[PDB]
């Protein structure tokens, strides 16, 4: 575990992370995709060997010794708000199990279902609160990655509020 488990936010490409493993915002079919998924595919293409996994699940594949946790959040274009919310909570619980099992002291994690799977809604709070619910009982240092300047400020505020 980390000596003082923390949450941080960085506004940068998660493919450049400084952590012991990465969570991919994956698609169910283990395809290269777009956004975080495409960056992950460019950096760690070996991790897409048999990475296909259902919505609401996480599947880890090693790129050398570096673990890539493929977490499949729901596409809110396809799911009801109710069913999407349940699958998004579930994907993050499966990320917490994998981070624990791997014994890492840090993890780089994007906000699942906040991009092309958001169904054109702002889901920062929804996705961030499911991330906290899952990861709060883990002792890894968690570093949340984003690209938008206003999102970085809101994620930072939400982290500081609890401290
Ligand atoms: Cl960057
Ligand atoms: Cl997304
Ligand atoms: Cl963002």
Curated annotation (Swiss-Prot):
PTM annotation: Phosphorylated by host on serines and threonines.
Effect the entry attributes to changing residue 117 to A: Partial loss of mono-ADP-ribosylhydrolase activity; complete loss of ADP-ribose 1'' phosphate phosphatase activity
Signal peptide start-end: none
Residue numbers binding ADP-D-ribose: 13, 27, 35, 115-117
Intracellular or extracellular location(s): Host cytoplasmic vesicle membrane
Domain Macro: 4-163
Membrane topology (UniProt): Peripheral membrane protein
Coiled-coil region list: none
Self-association and partners: Interacts with mRNA-capping enzyme nsP1. Interacts (via C-terminus) with host G3BP1; this interaction inhibits the formation of host stress granules on viral mRNAs and the nsp3-G3BP1 complexes bind viral RNAs and probably orchestrate the assembly of viral replication complexes. Interacts (via C-terminus) with host G3BP2; this interaction inhibits the formation of host stress granules on viral mRNAs and the nsp3-G3BP2 complexes bind viral RNAs and probably orchestrate the assembly of viral replication complexes. Interacts (via C-terminus) with host NAP1L1.
Protein task: Seems to be essential for minus-strand RNAs and subgenomic 26S mRNAs synthesis. Displays mono-ADP-ribosylhydrolase activity. ADP-ribosylation is a post-translational modification that controls various processes of the host cell and the virus probably needs to revert it for optimal viral replication. Binds proteins of G3BP family and sequesters them into the viral RNA replication complexes thereby inhibiting the formation of host stress granules on viral mRNAs.
Domain notes: In the N-terminus, the macro domain displays a mono-ADP-ribosylhydrolase activity. The central part called, the alphavirus unique domain (AUD) has a zinc-binding function. The C-terminus region, also called hypervariable domain (HVD), is mainly disordered and binds several host proteins. This intrinsically disordered domain contains 2 SH3 domain-binding sites and 2 FGDF motifs necessary and sufficient for the formation of nsP3/G3BP complexes.
Protein name: Non-structural protein 3
Organism in which the protein naturally occurs: Chikungunya virus (strain S27-African prototype) (CHIKV)
């Amino acid at each position: 575990g980390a000596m003082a488990p923390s949450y941080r936010v960085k506004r940068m490409d998660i493919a450049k992370n400084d952590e012991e493993c990465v969570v991919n915002a994956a698609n169910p079919r283990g395809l290269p995709g777009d956004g975080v998924c495409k960056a992950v595919y460019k950096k760690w293409p070996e991790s897409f060997k048999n990475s296909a996994t259902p919505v609401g699940t996480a599947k880890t594949v090693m790129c050398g010794t570096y673990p890539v946790i493929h977490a499949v959040g729901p596409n809110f274009s396809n799911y009801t708000e109710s069913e999407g919310d349940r699958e998004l909570a579930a994907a993050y619980r499966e990320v917490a199990k994998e981070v624990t099992r791997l014994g890492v002291n840090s993890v780089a994690i994007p906000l699942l279902s906040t991009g092309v799977y958001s169904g054109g809604k702002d889901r920062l709070t929804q996705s961030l609160n499911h991330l906290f619910t899952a990861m709060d009982s883990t002792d890894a240092d968690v570093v949340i990655y984003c690209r938008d300047k206003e999102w970085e400020k809101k994620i930072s505020e939400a982290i500081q509020m609890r401290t």
